Design a binder for this molecule. Sequence first.
Ligand SMILES: Nc1nc2c(ncn2[C@@H]2O[C@H](COP(=O)(O)OP(=O)(O)OP(=O)(O)O)[C@@H](O)[C@H]2O)c(=O)[nH]1
Ligand SMILES: Nc1nc2c(ncn2[C@@H]2O[C@H](COP(=O)(O)OP(=O)(O)OP(=O)(O)O)[C@@H](O)[C@H]2O)c(=O)[nH]1
Ligand SMILES: Nc1nc2c(ncn2[C@@H]2O[C@H](COP(=O)(O)OP(=O)(O)O)[C@@H](O)[C@H]2O)c(=O)[nH]1
Ligand SMILES: [Mg+2]
Ligand SMILES: [Mg+2]
Lengths: 430, 442, 442, 331
Amino acid sequence: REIVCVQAGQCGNQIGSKFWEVISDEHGVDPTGTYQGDSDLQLERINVYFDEATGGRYVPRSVLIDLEPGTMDSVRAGPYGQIFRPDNFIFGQSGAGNNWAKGHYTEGAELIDSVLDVCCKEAESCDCLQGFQICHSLGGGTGSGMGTLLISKLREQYPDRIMMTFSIIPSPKVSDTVVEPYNTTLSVHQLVENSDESMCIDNEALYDICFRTLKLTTPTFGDLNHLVSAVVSGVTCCLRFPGQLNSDLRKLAVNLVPFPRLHFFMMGFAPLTSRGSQQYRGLSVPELTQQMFDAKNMMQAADPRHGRYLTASALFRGRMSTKEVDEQMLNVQNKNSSYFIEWIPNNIKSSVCDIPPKGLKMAVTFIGNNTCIQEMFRRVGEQFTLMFRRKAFLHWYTGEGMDEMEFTEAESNMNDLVSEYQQYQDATIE
Amino acid sequence: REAICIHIGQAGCQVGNACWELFCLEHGIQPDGAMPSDKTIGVEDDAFNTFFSETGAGKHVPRAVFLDLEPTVVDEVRTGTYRQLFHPEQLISGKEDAANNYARGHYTIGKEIVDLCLDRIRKLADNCTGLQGFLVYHAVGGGTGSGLGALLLERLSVDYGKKSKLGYTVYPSPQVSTAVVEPYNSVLSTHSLLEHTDVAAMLDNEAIYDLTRRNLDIERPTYTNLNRLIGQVVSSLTASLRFDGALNVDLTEFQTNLVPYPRIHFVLTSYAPVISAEKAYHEQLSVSEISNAVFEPASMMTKCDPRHGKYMACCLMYRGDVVPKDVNAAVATIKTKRTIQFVDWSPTGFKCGINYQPPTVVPGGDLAKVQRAVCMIANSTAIAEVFARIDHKFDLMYSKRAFVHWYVGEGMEEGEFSEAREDLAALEKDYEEVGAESADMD
Amino acid sequence: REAICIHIGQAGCQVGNACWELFCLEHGIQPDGAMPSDKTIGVEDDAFNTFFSETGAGKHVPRAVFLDLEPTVVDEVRTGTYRQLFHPEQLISGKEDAANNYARGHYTIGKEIVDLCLDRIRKLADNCTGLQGFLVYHAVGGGTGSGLGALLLERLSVDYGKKSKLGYTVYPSPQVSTAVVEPYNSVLSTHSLLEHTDVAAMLDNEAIYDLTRRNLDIERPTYTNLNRLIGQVVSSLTASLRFDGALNVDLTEFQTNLVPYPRIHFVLTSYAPVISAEKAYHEQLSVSEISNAVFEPASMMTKCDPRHGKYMACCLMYRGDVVPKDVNAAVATIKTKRTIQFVDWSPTGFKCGINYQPPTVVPGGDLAKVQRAVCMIANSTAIAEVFARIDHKFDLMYSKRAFVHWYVGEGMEEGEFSEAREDLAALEKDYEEVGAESADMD
Amino acid sequence: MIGGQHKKERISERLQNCQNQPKNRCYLPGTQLLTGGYSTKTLQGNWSEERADAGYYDGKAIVPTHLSKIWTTEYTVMTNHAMKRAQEQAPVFDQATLVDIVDRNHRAYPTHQPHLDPQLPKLKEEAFKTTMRTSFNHPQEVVRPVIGNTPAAQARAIIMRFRRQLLISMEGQSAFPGNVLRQVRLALERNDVVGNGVLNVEETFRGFTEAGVETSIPECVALVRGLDMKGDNMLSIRKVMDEMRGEERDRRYSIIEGVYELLKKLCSNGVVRLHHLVDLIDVDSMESVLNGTVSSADALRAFTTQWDLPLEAHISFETFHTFFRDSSFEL
Ligand SMILES: Nc1nc2c(ncn2[C@@H]2O[C@H](COP(=O)(O)OP(=O)(O)OP(=O)(O)O)[C@@H](O)[C@H]2O)c(=O)[nH]1
Ligand SMILES: Nc1nc2c(ncn2[C@@H]2O[C@H](COP(=O)(O)OP(=O)(O)OP(=O)(O)O)[C@@H](O)[C@H]2O)c(=O)[nH]1
Ligand SMILES: Nc1nc2c(ncn2[C@@H]2O[C@H](COP(=O)(O)OP(=O)(O)O)[C@@H](O)[C@H]2O)c(=O)[nH]1
Ligand SMILES: [Mg+2]
Ligand SMILES: [Mg+2]
């Protein structure tokens, strides 16, 4: 049961480098690619993320795509960069220019066939293929346009598998680029049709994690990408290690999605504690569950307290009793009963895996389906409506060739997504 | 003489590990399949034959299959300690799970696996000379246990016909829960299970957690404890086939005495001397004390209270140092009690069994060593409460067609929900009519 | 079985340093929170639990919070030797002091800090299973101790309710003084303490200076000596929870036995064998000598003369090698004395406690090592003289509004002075009425 | 670590001409870890968390200065006694581990410090363990409460454990009961070096290890501290052996005193000697000789040797009592 990864754009390649560091560490793979682990339990599922090279080596099933090679030269220069297969790097000769239409229509259609050829070569090698995993930013240029193009083509070619995305969305407080609303709106329109499961992250939420919980004096993008690499590598842990109650991406989707459009989820990871404090408080299931549901520990700016949970899932790693897990989930559902949608009799799924990450006794990753996702899209739509009425920068997109009708369609589809979440928020039994 | 065990999915394989641990240790088979040759044995013996067959070299191999759609649990069994005990063909594993979808197990994926399973079961049934039933262990909350268990029971029922099928199912607990879609899978499972099963022993996890907290002194139990208790129950029920006794009880006698009408085969279970080693030396454990224990609801392994219903039949199995006169005095004392009531059409409410072999003690176990034990299976109308609450949760979800697109997309008609829900409504009425005292006769 | 300590302002934190030094050294916990390998072998014990909780790795951390508005004292704790003992979240510090203004602590500045304090206490109290009271240390002469102590006790009293709160309070001594505005702050503090405290223990620095000059031979004492004496007293009162004994005394029994009417909760404290090494080797120290000692006014830690009033209740705690018959003989001899008088409505005037653990010796300390000690807390009408002198100093200043513009500028109505002064006047009249020698039959 | 040497520039950084902020190591001139606009020496901002770092170093010379001695705080004077003892031990790392700490290689989250966790090696041994492998091993392979922190309680618990171990072990069983405690006492006597009959912690450990009891150094520290009544950490052999014999029941005492009173009247001037006991004993009446498993001569020979006295020694009541408390330990 093998996963294929795709890394697109600057953000995607940077997050990917930290992810593949974490995965290589957990399976005891040296930065040369040689296996150096210390238990057989590591080897029996190495196939899930690694391909086998001949003598010692293992190679990671990932495709790297970008429009200017600057990022690729940076990732090849990183500490684990050597592990990546040379043939898996696909690049052009000029940048996306932060423009969705350029990235989607002109250089996209030129390169996309060589990427599809690489993805098919990689897909047909698996003995049984599980879903794809995609990392990209929505605010950029090549990430949004070429990522969504590629997602649409893979959904055409492999409609029965799972499609999973991790996606970066513009912060509410400071922009890194002026034209973020257009690229975000077009990408959310593409994603809500194409995706099976989508995770959303705000950089502002990672800064608040670092400053309030970890009390870092001078955080850097390496810390944010380490938190993200931790949750991404955590969601798949039950796929690749034994446990008392196994779980799977399809099983997560089946338990999380009540209706097919409602597939946008919030993420959290529980054991976070400052360097001074960690000696002062031991890990236990009550402590992990209480931090796990605190909105301070959630990776988006919207807070659950303004909405209601339709469904949630928790994956626990470590050797622990099932009774304590079950009774904690019952106690949280009973004490806070107004925040859970009442026409579903039990909203939380649990899963248990024996093997924690090294140097932690226990860990949990949390996936939540909460109606507060509507607040992010509404804010992006507001900034879009302010810019679009005045044609603020539209000539760039029209000069690439786009019809204005695409913008009105994408706006209408995002507004309908917000409306559907709002209606289920305010729904009643009657 | 012989019985074949079928283990399905995660709960069924994990419970199988505890069961086969117990049957090995009780007969004396080592984890490598070879009994200790010792110096000599004075007379030839056969009790293992119910569960083991010997090769011409004297290795033992067990009469069981392990069925799963995901590899991980069966590969875990394959790599464990009992590797050499099982025949490798018996451990059957697919590629991918039924993802909590009954439809994926029944229609799409199990249809590929069933012919290998049927060929293995045929090869087992050909190596028997007095097969007298199937024992089935599965959970109805998950996708493959429900869907493939139903499909396989249907095929077994057509090919083998009249042979008996006894199930030790694990139904969903009344407020502890593990997955969202449990009501749909349990309803759809129960629809198939109604037509094609002879005696359904129903178990819940919340009761065994309560039992391990209250009687044993364990604050943080895990599935190995529950599975060892279940294994003890199975060993108690099958002991009547395997060892000498005063009053033996063949598996056909359970069905004859316990089942009044062909749909009324849902039963409750209870086991008496669950006790720790430190408590065990302060108290005697006479026949009448454990008989009084088995009727308290704190002893039951399912979450239902029998005081809200009427008993129809009870079957009491005593094993160990017991004398029939003490069993008779105990049953007469129970019969005297006013909070135990039988339906007026069942005057002779009890079946007894008495076996000389005391319960075995497992090295890592938590139960004390005791000279006698009693195990009960009983039919009571209080089991209606278990269904009505599952059906209410189904109605709550189905009013909004909750998650339904998964089931309809993977190949199932929407019509299938309404038929099953109407069948469970009819089961509720069966329990209403059977529980009615009398009519307006002259 | 548990108690939580709250330390406020400068006097309360500095006395806390001596207390936690003592409790660590008495249990055997190292300054880094560990416990040596030989204290934890052969037997498994829980006595630390009253004051410490252990992590799963076996580090000890203490059940205390430190509250201040100025950083300096808490920064001394953060950079000192006990840095690793305390959890860093427990040590809470503001930006700027309450500047001897009750109004600044209560209205303006403490209102910002109080919610962090309540969140820490809540997080502590949730991780308990037998909390049995709050211990509070503060001085009523300063601004933050009065204002924030009152505000925090009010909030604690609403949130936790019936749970008991015992305060150790340093009141302004009758002629040594350190700041001009002490009478205003002490009156306004006492108004809040009347409603929201169960027992209040009164201390004066002038008495501990006299005791250290007279019994010990120290001409030039400093605050570390006084704080070590206070720590010994607190250890004596809390020893009844922590060690084996003949006659235990639970913290609720103090409140039940000492308080006759709900306002009459202010008690005097004294300690017997305060003695130097050269005197200690010249004298035997039997039970009757220390029992006679605790009633002499030279032994008291508050500057009041009990000969000007009548006792209502006494509670005598003996620790060390004492046998109950000598305690009974001693109390009967005290009862015989003519200069000791009890109110005629309190015939059975005494409560006794006897604990086997002798008092601990601190390496730099000035007390001798002794086999037995006794500590007394007692309720007496003589305390009314202390309030009358505070009221006279308040009346002198308030007749001309000598400093009031500071208090009015920081947010306080002038009316609150008159309200507090009338409430303390009513307390004086309560002590006059309760102490009535006799009532007429007609 | 002393003198820094891990905050300085590395050769690879110099050769590659690396700048500061990509890795944010403050070693280049003009850059410094400024918390609140000031260095970590000043108490502003996040100094407490930055001082909690694994790689933190304070620029304090080991050789002290004069003004540090002159300028001291009252709190420092109060708490200096504990500081002198607490400064004896501190964890240390080599240079490769410090490189790993600075580079923050193996961490679950950015602030995870595994090298400061005292339970790391047992976590590493405990890693990669599955529920079934632990719970389903090979079936063939798989106390009176005492309350108080008082050292007497620890001593009593240790004595009870030792007695249980000797009963289950039973080395040196002879033809006449009463040789186990004799062997333990002889083993203790042999490892005394001075001749006054007292032992310290280390000799106690060696003696009890020779006697066959598995112990540890903390056990002996606790035992010697508990049984000490004169404040010198010396263990008396007589006291510990008397505690090993235990409390004596009334019936056994009655029989012993009755036999002694009978033997006293058969001698001259009421003085009983050891040859009286050897001559008058009736060894062929025990259950162990009539059943046919121990010969009579061997039993008498075992009895005569266990006294450890010449044949003309006066046997007082104390010696008789102690001898038969030693023998009752096996019945
Ligand atoms: N008593 C007991 N219950 C178990 C055990 N294992 C799983 N369960 C319970 O059974 C339910 C889960 O059913 P599973 O067996 O995991 O479902 P499945 O057969 O694997 O179906 P799929 O998930 O589609 O593969 C939950 O309620 C679990 O609590 C077990 O070993 N003992
Ligand atoms: N026994 C003892 N008394 C002290 C100590 N510190 C201060 N005092 C006395 O308490 C009174 C001063 O109260 P403070 O604690 O300084 O007032 P505060 O709590 O700091 O209030 P602010 O000045 O607003 O910060 C004076 O009578 C001092 O003599 C101490 O450490 N021990
Ligand atoms: N969390 C995170 N965000 C990043 C990283 N690199 C860039 N970004 C953000 O992504 C956006 C820029 O998008 P970019 O990746 O340059 O788009 P591209 O030009 O199409 O590749 C900005 O909001 C950046 O803040 C990173 O390593 N981590
Ligand atoms: Mg499964
Ligand atoms: Mg102050």
